[PDB]
Amino acid sequence: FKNIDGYFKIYSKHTPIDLPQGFSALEPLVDLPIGINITRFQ
Amino acid sequence: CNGVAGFNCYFPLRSYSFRPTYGVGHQPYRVVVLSFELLHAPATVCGP
Ligand SMILES: *[C@@H]1O[C@H](CO)[C@@H](O)[C@H](O)[C@H]1NC(C)=O
Numbered sequence: 001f002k003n004i005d006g007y008f009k010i011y012s013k014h015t016p017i018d019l020p021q022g023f024s025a026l027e028p029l030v031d032l033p034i035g036i037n038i039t040r041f042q
Numbered sequence: 043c044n045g046v047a048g049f050n051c052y053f054p055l056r057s058y059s060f061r062p063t064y065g066v067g068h069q070p071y072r073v074v075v076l077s078f079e080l081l082h083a084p085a086t087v088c089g090p
Contacts, residue, residue, distance in 0.1 A: 006084050033084035034084075035084050
């Protein structure tokens with residue numbers, strides 16, 4: 001999750017298998033023109 | 043006026059009672075107003 005230049009960007013990746021080994025890039029999923037201020041999440 | 047009509051107590055509404063028999067400059071006009079915003083913004087709405 002990133003928030004830059006008034007855009008919210010979400011990248012995602014899924015895999016069927018403590019964190020595993022190996023390399024696997026994440027592909028872009030969604031961009032949103034929301035333009036708010038973000039400081040905390042849950 | 044204790045919530046009742048009377049002298050100096052007028053209901054602030056008035057009816058139109060539109061009829062097809064009025065003059066040309068008397069029938070109701072259907073009006074719309076479109077307002078834009080020319081500023082720096084994400085610019086969600088844009089033309090074809
Ligand atoms: C977001 O909030 C922080 C802390 O209140 C403030 O420093 C920052 O300027 C704000 N940014 C925007 C774009 O409102």
